[PDB]
């Protein structure tokens, strides 16, 4: 009966918030002071935490989920009674982990050898990505691009074909029709008096919103192609799909490395204040104190005190072995900290706002039950970080914080260099982000059979992205699997949804801030109403659905992409003038070979 489940979950919370703490503390202590003793000590803490959570799952199964009247205790049972794994035969559980561990090692250890010099070989990140980020030699890039797929991608293909079976048996045994729908499960909402949402309804709202982005994207594609024809003469058709090896990395995921090739007005220096930070003699403490001044200026709470001593903002004075990768940490017990190794830079001033914007989210739902202390969906959690960096990147913020002079002036040509540099990150990836998820949603349901996995992929790169194979491919490759998110089993749809929600939140706070200008100039400062509408959504955690948290900030019960397009209307108006004599969109029939 229901009231027993309240008391069972009260036991779980008071047990879990402590096991979670000393586990995540041992993980922190390892990350900041790496030794094999610290590896062992963090691993067997993570072990004893996992061992508790799975025992409590079989004890949570004991409760009838359908009898629960309370919605909050019901979310906590549903999230603990989940089976996830185990449902398999144990030899198929062992085989699945063996395959995942094998795709993980092949992706990370993967060497590509130079055919000119078979004694020299490159991992993925050192040298092989660097050619794709900084070379302008079409043949050196094409060599790195096709060698990654023909040397490493061909080893991931035969693993992916067995992983797709084991994932779908597990999803079915959990009663989802396929493992693509198991992932979608995050967004599911039921019984909440008009705020409900289906797993499948995500696919229709993605495909309804994405075709409002296509008009903006097709002019950005045409402009990028018209510039790349000067970097790569004869290699590109003025109506062609873009060859994949030219797009700034190993996959073409973001177009942002093409800024230096594509720039509107490069003789106007796109703004920096790193020089102002070093001439004002700022340090890691100042960098974060002027970031804190922004959150208290919008009316949010300040650092949880013990943050300042228990955080690491700098690489130590001791020659310590540590991971300096910037990360906001929550460890429970109200213990919020931030691990990074900052260097006096505006990129770091803006990462300080981005990561502090994660801590500022965690603190609002600290009063929720433990099982509910997460974002309203997997997309919101980076989107609530970035809107602080959007604020801090403005020249209005930078002149109020003393990083720009009172006599510094913004010219139109600086604004369009800025918005194009943004669009190559924010908009250029959205076809790839819908398409890679569409391909996995089609693979897990079997709408693409294994004699069409690679056939369908390059028809979709050509149709949805306007991007084309430099060399023909076949079912002995797996170009999707040549990527971390596909080889390490990570659902990508959180990035599309987060990139929509981000601009809805931006424009809702802009209206509260009485904002008189274009959406991109907008600063979250000295505004009170904005902080109040923000905090009243931030403090809900998982307890209320994302479908309701949106109408709290934005006024809308679902995702809307108009605000993202309204960040870019000044740029799109310019791109149209830069495309009048040109061809817009692409021919799917064209190939570079």
């Amino acid at each position: 009966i229901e009231e027993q489940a309240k008391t069972f979950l009260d036991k779980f919370n008071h047990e879990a918030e402590d096991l979670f703490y000393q586990s995540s503390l041992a993980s922190w202590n390892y990350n900041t002071n790496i030794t094999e003793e610290n590896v062992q000590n963090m691993n067997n803490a993570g072990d004893k935490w996992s061992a508790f959570l799975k025992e409590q799952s079989t004890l949570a199964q004991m409760y009838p989920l359908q009898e629960i009247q309370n919605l909050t205790v019901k979310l906590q049972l549903q999230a603990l009674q989940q089976n996830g794994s185990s449902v398999l035969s144990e030899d198929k559980s062992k085989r699945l982990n063996t395959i995942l561990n094998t795709m993980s090692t092949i992706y990370s250890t993967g060497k590509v050898c130079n055919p000119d010099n078979p004694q020299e070989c490159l991992l993925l990140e050192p040298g092989l990505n660097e050619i794709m980020a900084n070379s302008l030699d079409y043949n050196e890039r094409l060599w790195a691009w096709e060698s990654w797929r023909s040397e490493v991608g061909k080893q991931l293909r035969p693993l992916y074909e067995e992983y797709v079976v084991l994932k779908n048996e597990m999803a079915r045994a959990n009663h989802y029709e396929d493992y693509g729908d198991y992932w979608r499960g995050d967004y599911e909402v039921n019984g909440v008096d008009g705020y409900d949402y289906s797993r499948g309804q995500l696919i229709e709202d993605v495909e309804h919103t994405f075709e409002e982005i296509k008009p903006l994207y097709e002019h950005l594609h045409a402009y990028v192609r018209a510039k790349l024809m000067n970097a790569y003469p004869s290699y590109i058709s003025p109506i062609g799909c873009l060859p994949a090896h030219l797009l700034g990395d190993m996959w073409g995921r973001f177009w942002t490395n093409l800024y230096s090739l594509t720039v509107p007005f490069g003789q106007k220096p796109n703004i920096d204040v790193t020089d102002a930070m070093v001439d004002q003699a700022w340090d890691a403490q100042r960098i974060f104190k002027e970031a804190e001044k922004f959150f208290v200026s919008v009316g949010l709470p300040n650092m949880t005190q013990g943050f300042w001593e228990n955080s690491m903002l700098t690489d130590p004075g001791n020659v310590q072995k540590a991971v300096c990768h910037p990360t906001a940490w929550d460890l429970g017990k109200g213990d919020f900290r931030i691990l990074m190794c900052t260097k006096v830079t505006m990129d770091d001033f803006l990462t300080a706002h981005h990561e502090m914007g994660h801590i500022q989210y965690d603190m609002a739902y600290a009063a929720q039950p433990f099982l509910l202390r997460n974002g309203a969906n997997e997309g919101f959690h980076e989107a609530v970080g970035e809107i602080m960096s959007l604020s801090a990147a403005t020249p209005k913020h930078l002149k109020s914080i003393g990083l720009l002079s009172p006599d510094f002036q913004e010219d139109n040509e600086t604004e369009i260099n800025f918005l194009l540099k943004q669009a190559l990150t924010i908009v250029g990836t959205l076809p790839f982000t819908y398409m890679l998820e569409k391909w996995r949603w089609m693979v897990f349901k079997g709408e693409i059979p294994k004699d069409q996995w690679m056939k369908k992929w390059w028809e979709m790169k050509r149709e949805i992205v306007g991007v084309v194979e430099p060399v023909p491919h076949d079912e002995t490759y797996c170009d999707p699997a040549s990527l971390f998110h596909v080889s390490n089993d990570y659902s990508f749809i959180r990035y599309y949804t987060r990139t929509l929600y981000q601009f809805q939140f931006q424009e809702a706070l802009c209206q509260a801030a009485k904002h008189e200008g274009p959406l991109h100039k907008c600063d979250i400062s000295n505004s009170t109403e904005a902080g109040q509408k923000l905090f009243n959504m931030l403090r809900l955690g998982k307890s209320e659905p994302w479908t309701l948290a949106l109408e709290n900030v934005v006024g809308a019960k679902n995702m809307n992409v108009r605000p993202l397009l309204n960040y870019f209307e000044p740029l799109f108006t310019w791109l149209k003038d830069q495309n009048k004599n040109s061809f817009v969109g692409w021919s799917t029939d064209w190939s570079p070979y």
Binding site: E3, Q4, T7, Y21, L59, K333, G334, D335
Partner: protein, 99 residues
């Protein structure tokens, strides 16, 4: 939770004051002596108990809870729990989780 008129897990099951309390409440932060990095599980608390307390019941009685209709003779498997838990006090806790 420590007052006349207040409610909560302590105020129902550990420490009640009369709602017209003749007296005062004093408290001070004790991270610097009550907590150590190993987890000072020394302090316990009544997480579960039947009915409710009266004011000033220091009821040391320690037997397994049991909710709804189940018998329970120890083991504490399901719907029945040992009534006490420790505080996990550590000097690295945040302010509201400090001793």
């Amino acid at each position: 939770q420590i007052a006349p008129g207040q409610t909560g897990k302590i105020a129902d099951y550990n420490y009640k004051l009369p709602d017209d309390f003749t007296g005062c409440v004093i408290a001070w932060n004790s991270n610097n002596l009550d907590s150590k990095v190993g987890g000072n599980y020394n302090y316990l608390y009544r997480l579960f108990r039947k009915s409710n307390l009266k004011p000033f019941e220091r009821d040391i009685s320690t037997e397994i809870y049991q909710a709804g209709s189940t018998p329970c003779n120890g083991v504490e498997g399901f719907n029945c729990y040992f009534p006490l838990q420790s505080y996990g006090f550590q000097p690295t806790n945040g302010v509201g989780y400090q001793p």
